[PDB]
Amino acid sequence: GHWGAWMPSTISAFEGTCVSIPCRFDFPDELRPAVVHGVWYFNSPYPKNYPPVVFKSRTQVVHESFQGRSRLLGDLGLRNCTLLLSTLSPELGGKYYFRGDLGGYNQYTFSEHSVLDIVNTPNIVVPPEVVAGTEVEVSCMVPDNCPELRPELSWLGHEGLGEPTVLGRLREDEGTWVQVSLLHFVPTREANGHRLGCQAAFPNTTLQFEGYASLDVKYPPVIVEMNSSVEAIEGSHVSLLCGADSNPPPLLTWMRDGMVLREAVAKSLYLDLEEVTPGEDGVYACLAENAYGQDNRTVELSVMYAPWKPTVNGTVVAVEGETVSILCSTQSNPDPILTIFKEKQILATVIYESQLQLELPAVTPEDDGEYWCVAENQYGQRATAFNLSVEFAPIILLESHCAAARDTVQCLCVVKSNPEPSVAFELPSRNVTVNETEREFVYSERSGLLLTSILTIRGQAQAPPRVICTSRNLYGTQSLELPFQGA
Amino acid sequence: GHWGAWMPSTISAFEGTCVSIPCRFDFPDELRPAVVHGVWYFNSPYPKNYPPVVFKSRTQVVHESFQGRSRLLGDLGLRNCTLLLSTLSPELGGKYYFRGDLGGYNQYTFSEHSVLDIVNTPNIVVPPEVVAGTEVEVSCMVPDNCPELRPELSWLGHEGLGEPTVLGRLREDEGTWVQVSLLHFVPTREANGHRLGCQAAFPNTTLQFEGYASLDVKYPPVIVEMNSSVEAIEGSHVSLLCGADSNPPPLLTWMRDGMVLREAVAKSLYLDLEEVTPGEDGVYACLAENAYGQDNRTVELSVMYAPWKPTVNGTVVAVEGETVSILCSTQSNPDPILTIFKEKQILATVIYESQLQLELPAVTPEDDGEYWCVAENQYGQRATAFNLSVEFAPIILLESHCAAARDTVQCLCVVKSNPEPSVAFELPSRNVTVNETEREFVYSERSGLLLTSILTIRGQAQAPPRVICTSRNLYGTQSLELPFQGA
Numbered sequence A, B: 001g002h003w004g005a006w007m008p009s010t011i012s013a014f015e016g017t018c019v020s021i022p023c024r025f026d027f028p029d030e031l032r033p034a035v036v037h038g039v040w041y042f043n044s045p046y047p048k049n050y051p052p053v054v055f056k057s058r059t060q061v062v063h064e065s066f067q068g069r070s071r072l073l074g075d076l077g078l079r080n081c082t083l084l085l086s087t088l089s090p091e092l093g094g095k096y097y098f099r100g101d102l103g104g105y106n107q108y109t110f111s112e113h114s115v116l117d118i119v120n121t122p123n124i125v126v127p128p129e130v131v132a133g134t135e136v137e138v139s140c141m142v143p144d145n146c147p148e149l150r151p152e153l154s155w156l157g158h159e160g161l162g163e164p165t166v167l168g169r170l171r172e173d174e175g176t177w178v179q180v181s182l183l184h185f186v187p188t189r190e191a192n193g194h195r196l197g198c199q200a201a202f203p204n205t206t207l208q209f210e211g212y213a214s215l216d217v218k219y220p221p222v223i224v225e226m227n228s229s230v231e232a233i234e235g236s237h238v239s240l241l242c243g244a245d246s247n248p249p250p251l252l253t254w255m256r257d258g259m260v261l262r263e264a265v266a267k268s269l270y271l272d273l274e275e276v277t278p279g280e281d282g283v284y285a286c287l288a289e290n291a292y293g294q295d296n297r298t299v300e301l302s303v304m305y306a307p308w309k310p311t312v313n314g315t316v317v318a319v320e321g322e323t324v325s326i327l328c329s330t331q332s333n334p335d336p337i338l339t340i341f342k343e344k345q346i347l348a349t350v351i352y353e354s355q356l357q358l359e360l361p362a363v364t365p366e367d368d369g370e371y372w373c374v375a376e377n378q379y380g381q382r383a384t385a386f387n388l389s390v391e392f393a394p395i396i397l398l399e400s401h402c403a404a405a406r407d408t409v410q411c412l413c414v415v416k417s418n419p420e421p422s423v424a425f426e427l428p429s430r431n432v433t434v435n436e437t438e439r440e441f442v443y444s445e446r447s448g449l450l451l452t453s454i455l456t457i458r459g460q461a462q463a464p465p466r467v468i469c470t471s472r473n474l475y476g477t478q479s480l481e482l483p484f485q486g487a
């Protein structure tokens, strides 16, 4: 064929271990030299910039940095130029060329080369993404390019997780050989932050080389930091703490009835409320959402607040003998117990309810006065008041009399009615006496519901003059004869 | 003797009546003419201004205005020259001279003369001042200078008043003769404005001559126009009229308690008052004072006015079981009757007096409230009011109870006290239960004197928990166990 060669671009091995560079070449078969010499140049392609001579046919003189370190296996004449370099060191790490010397002026340095790496750490391969709910395999590749010292592998930090599987050497890249060791297992949620290692050793040696890798397992957020059902006062400070444990940043959302609130991405979100109201009462949900799974957890916040200042509707001023409905409303957050009562007497008692109604069958006069409505509760109590002032058909009280002093005669009659009662006296006075004695006579006064009135007849002997009292308003009329107590 | 004559300066007589001029003369007695002539000149003393010749000896020729009107009586030779002139007339009224004619160049007109008045009205003389309490005499003089026609007198408008006294002729002035007629009587108070007359006549004639005079009698003021005892309202118009009847201007004085007021001099003085006050009430005196006597008359003015707005002193806020004095004062001009009373009951009644006191023996709670004080009177009535608010050692009313609903148990206890009562509940609750059910419990309220309070024990079975109520103020303390009515 034509000129040309075959050599693996990349080759690697450990410290103190031999390498075996696979090499093959071609030259015009037209020439058949009986003696074929060859040279292994280091770090440089052109002879012009003098490179270290790794090996030369029929010549012991090489570079002093390769003296006793290298030797060629197999005749060149059979197109075989594989090379062995034992006991490596980091200086020897570089690029290697092969130049051929057959005949004269037919000396060719081949362009295609091989690069020598000198690594003392094995190569571990792990999947880009490790899900906590899928089966995962991790490999440990070690570059065995030495047939005399065959390396053996070890798994450090295995912690069970099933047996390690083993392979012989596989055909890595272009003709190079590598012993691989794979591990097959399925992670949990604790697999993250774990350390996995791979060791390599040889029988007759004190050489031991090791490599590491830390796992990044992706688990779905499961909410741990979640406080339960709470009860807080209005105005007080409310601190809800929501925490999710996911290795991928879990999208944490605070929501209620479909509201945005504070949406954020972290391991723990705070939700603060001040001036708590009955509107903020109820259920708050925290959703931990991740591309590997989701978890929602909910809490109940009961706002405990003293009952509102009560309000009362219904009738207030009705007639006598009628029906009266009084409706008392209150908006409390914890079940309020509320009672309504008159001065000295208690009327209606409702237990654990929002509002209370009281009905009155008929109105006796006494049902006038002011009543009270209290809303009692565990955390506080407020109240309100309402005057029931009914309408009356005038009632002349029997505290009424006619006292007779000797010289002059006087009477006292009292009534009670809601509107002011036009009051009057009637009397049987013998004959007709005008401008005699007195003509101005009586006087009257009122306090609240009571209308007191006093009569005074002047110059009347103890001869008992009968006296009658009458009272009218817009509703009723009453008349009554008064008795004697004096003399 | 020497030259000279004697003749009355003034002589007077009526119309148609003769006059007799008394005349005497003297001349040096050395000459004795045997023939003595004489002449009576009129109106002029000197012959130079030719005067009318009234008479001439041995000569009929006289003035034509004296022709047949005059004649001389008695011889001149006996020194007598008295002359008579009959049938007079107003022209002849003038001054008369006498001139003597004895011998030659011994002709003398005498300087002293006589003047002839011709009056047809008699002369009445009355005292300068005529007192109604003294005896008075009035004269009527008439000049009788005619011996042939002797005049006689008459009293016209005599009206009794006693007899007229009569005199003969008296010797008026210098030798002239006058018939006088005097009247003696004593006047009254009506004598003023009376008319007194004097007439004179002769027997054989139609001649009658008359004269007049009006009396000015001075009487002491006797008060006629005087209204009696009166009663008038304050603010009203008061008109006092005081009249005196005295012919001399009576000094009228309005006085009271020794005060000047309106002093004036007339027949009737007005005294006006407006905005009458209790200070102008009382006795007013009118004095009619004259230099001929005096008279005082008095009146009583009572001011009738509605009683003043009453004022009350004494205690107002005392303790329980104590004594209370309430003094109510009023200043009324007519005797006021006044009463004080409580709402519904009457307390004190005083009749026709200025002020009224009420005492209270002990104070029962009910003696609290507001009382009224009225001052009633014929012309009007005003009033005032006062709150008696006493102090109480707290009283727990027996409107108190313990109603037991099935689910929950509630109580109601009420007291009454003047200062606010610190109120409390005591109860036997088995074991000790704190923060269980309720810990706020009770509620209380107050109206006026009443302190209502309600208890509420929550979650207590119908197993009846006994309940006690206590109340303390600065005065007393009470405790009481309440009973069951529900279930």
Ligand SMILES: *[C@@H]1O[C@H](CO)[C@@H](O[C@@H]2O[C@H](CO)[C@@H](O[C@@H]3O[C@H](CO[C@H]4O[C@H](CO)[C@@H](O)[C@H](O)[C@@H]4O)[C@@H](O)[C@H](O[C@H]4O[C@H](CO)[C@@H](O)[C@H](O)[C@@H]4O)[C@@H]3O)[C@H](O)[C@H]2NC(C)=O)[C@H](O)[C@H]1NC(C)=O
Pocket (backbone or CB within 6 Å): A023, A024, A073, A074, A079, A080, A081, A082, A147, A148, A149
């Ligand atoms: C160019 O030429 C070279 C050789 O000149 C070829 O490369 C290889 O060179 C290595 C030298 O290190 C040879 O490895 C040796 O293998 C011997 C046994 O060969 C095996 O294969 C035959 C198959 O016919 C089997 O029957 C046999 O049982 C073997 O499994 C061993 O004797 C040597 O190892 C000894 O020492 C080690 C420890 O040091 C022990 O583990 C061994 O048991 C033994 O005692 C040695 O390792 C290898 O054989 C050569 N390969 C070939 C194919 O010849 C290149 O291939 C060639 N290239 C070109 C392009 O021509």
Ligand SMILES: *[C@@H]1O[C@H](CO)[C@@H](O[C@@H]2O[C@H](CO)[C@@H](O[C@@H]3O[C@H](CO[C@H]4O[C@H](CO)[C@@H](O)[C@H](O)[C@@H]4O)[C@@H](O)[C@H](O[C@H]4O[C@H](CO)[C@@H](O)[C@H](O)[C@@H]4O)[C@@H]3O)[C@H](O)[C@H]2NC(C)=O)[C@H](O)[C@H]1NC(C)=O
Pocket (backbone or CB within 6 Å): B023, B024, B073, B074, B079, B080, B081, B082, B147, B148, B149
């Ligand atoms: C100057 O002289 C004259 C007389 O010349 C004197 O004046 C008097 O004159 C009058 C004449 O009118 C004389 O009056 C007459 O009176 C006669 C009676 O005299 C009375 O007196 C004597 C007293 O001796 C009594 O006795 C006697 O009774 C008489 O009472 C009457 O006769 C005359 O009146 C007759 O007429 C009338 C009516 O006309 C009748 O009423 C008579 O009754 C009677 O009929 C006459 O009136 C008077 O006498 C003379 N007086 C005197 C004193 O002589 C002067 O006095 C004198 N003066 C001086 C200074 O010398």
Ligand SMILES: *[C@@H]1O[C@H](CO)[C@@H](O[C@@H]2O[C@H](CO)[C@@H](O)[C@H](O)[C@H]2NC(C)=O)[C@H](O)[C@H]1NC(C)=O
Pocket (backbone or CB within 6 Å): A370, A386, A387, B448
């Ligand atoms: C309810 O009734 C009371 C009287 O019983 C009304 O008036 C109060 O009376 C007290 C006297 O003890 C006064 O000191 C208060 O000032 C009064 N209140 C007011 C607002 O003036 C009261 O007004 C009545 N209320 C209603 C709503 O009818």
Ligand SMILES: *[C@@H]1O[C@H](CO)[C@@H](O[C@@H]2O[C@H](CO)[C@@H](O)[C@H](O)[C@H]2NC(C)=O)[C@H](O)[C@H]1NC(C)=O
Pocket (backbone or CB within 6 Å): A448, B370, B386, B387
């Ligand atoms: C006397 O008592 C009355 C109450 O009984 C006092 O107050 C009056 O109460 C009525 C309610 O019906 C109010 O409408 C009046 O306005 C109140 N009066 C005043 C002046 O405020 C009253 O004040 C008491 N008087 C005295 C002198 O103690």
Ligand SMILES: *[C@@H]1O[C@H](CO[C@@H]2O[C@@H](C)[C@@H](O)[C@@H](O)[C@@H]2O)[C@@H](O)[C@H](O)[C@H]1NC(C)=O
Pocket (backbone or CB within 6 Å): A311, A312, A313, A314, A327, A329
């Ligand atoms: C009292 O309530 C009134 C409304 O009446 C109530 O509601 C209607 C729909 C019916 O159910 C009826 O039976 C109820 O009584 C209001 O108009 C009024 O403003 C209210 N007043 C107060 C004090 O809240």
Ligand SMILES: *[C@@H]1O[C@H](CO[C@@H]2O[C@@H](C)[C@@H](O)[C@@H](O)[C@@H]2O)[C@@H](O)[C@H](O)[C@H]1NC(C)=O
Pocket (backbone or CB within 6 Å): B311, B312, B313, B314, B327, B329
């Ligand atoms: C009530 O009168 C008081 C005076 O007291 C009275 O007069 C004295 C001299 C004694 O006679 C005593 O017994 C009387 O009670 C006054 O100080 C007070 O201002 C008066 N108040 C009124 C309301 O008028």
Ligand SMILES: *[C@@H]1O[C@H](CO)[C@@H](O)[C@H](O)[C@H]1NC(C)=O
Pocket (backbone or CB within 6 Å): A202, A203, A204, A205
């Ligand atoms: C040492 O190497 C020899 C090869 O010469 C091998 O047979 C032997 O098993 C090895 N022994 C140890 C202990 O490494």
Ligand SMILES: *[C@@H]1O[C@H](CO)[C@@H](O)[C@H](O)[C@H]1NC(C)=O
Pocket (backbone or CB within 6 Å): A227, A228, A229, A230, A239, A240, A241
């Ligand atoms: C959550 O509720 C519990 C009651 O079980 C309470 O003790 C805790 O303090 C609450 N924590 C937060 C953060 O609200």
Ligand SMILES: *[C@@H]1O[C@H](CO)[C@@H](O)[C@H](O)[C@H]1NC(C)=O
Pocket (backbone or CB within 6 Å): A287, A294, A295, A296
């Ligand atoms: C909440 O989680 C439950 C799992 O029990 C799931 O069925 C539901 O769909 C989730 N809801 C949301 C809004 O993510």
Ligand SMILES: *[C@@H]1O[C@H](CO)[C@@H](O)[C@H](O)[C@H]1NC(C)=O
Pocket (backbone or CB within 6 Å): B202, B203, B204, B205
């Ligand atoms: C008249 O006058 C004479 C005198 O001559 C006298 O006597 C007589 O009384 C008189 N008579 C009357 C009526 O006048």
Ligand SMILES: *[C@@H]1O[C@H](CO)[C@@H](O)[C@H](O)[C@H]1NC(C)=O
Pocket (backbone or CB within 6 Å): B227, B228, B229, B230, B239, B240, B241
């Ligand atoms: C005087 O008093 C009487 C009452 O007798 C009365 O009628 C009269 O009008 C009063 N006159 C005056 C001027 O006051």
Ligand SMILES: *[C@@H]1O[C@H](CO)[C@@H](O)[C@H](O)[C@H]1NC(C)=O
Pocket (backbone or CB within 6 Å): B287, B294, B295, B296
């Ligand atoms: C009033 O008149 C009487 C007469 O009865 C008299 O005594 C008294 O002094 C007179 N008083 C005065 C002040 O003039």
Ligand SMILES: *[C@H]1O[C@H](CO)[C@@H](O)[C@H](O)[C@@H]1O
Pocket (backbone or CB within 6 Å): A001, A002, A003, A004, A027, A028
């Ligand atoms: C190597 O040298 C030249 C390169 O073109 C050719 O004649 C032939 O490929 C030979 O083998």
Ligand SMILES: *[C@H]1O[C@H](CO)[C@@H](O)[C@H](O)[C@@H]1O
Pocket (backbone or CB within 6 Å): B001, B002, B003, B004, B027, B028
């Ligand atoms: C009248 O005349 C003269 C006046 O002096 C005197 O000689 C005498 O008085 C005589 O009578």
